Amino acid sequence: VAAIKSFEVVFNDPEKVYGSGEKVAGRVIVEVCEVTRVKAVRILACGVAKVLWMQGSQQCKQTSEYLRYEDTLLLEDQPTGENEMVIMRPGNKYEYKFGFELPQGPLGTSFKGKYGCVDYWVKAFLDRPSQPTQETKKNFEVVDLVDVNTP
Secondary structure (H helix, E strand, C coil): CCCEEEEEEEECCCCCCECCCCEEEEEEEEEECCCEEECEEEEEEEEEECEEEECCEEEEECCCCCEEEEEECCECCCCCCCCCCEEECCCCCEEEEEEEECCCCCCEEEECCCEECEEEEEEEEEEECCEEEEEEEEEECECCEEECCCC
């Protein structure tokens, strides 16, 4: 797709379910079918409150984010702090490490221990000059949810 063979978020431990204060670590990986100039690879990691009305009232009460982390990532084995466009060539994996820590408190709420009131995910964005930005999105799972009516 416009030179792009693959674009994905890969967690270092694909089976890990994350709790309070824990590091979420992974890579954004790009592969191309032909030479292409890349301006940036960015991430947005969010924990978004879901809104759910049941039993005649709002249960998942929604409101504000638990997490919103934005960054521009560095290609593996490039100099730290450097601002440089990348010429991606076929036959190579272009890997960008990321890592963020989750908040110390509860990571969200749950209704009747069945309906999780929060969505966590990582989006990545592939920016290229005079070309539409491409997006990828991957969900991740959390624990440390508390009941909606917890004091």
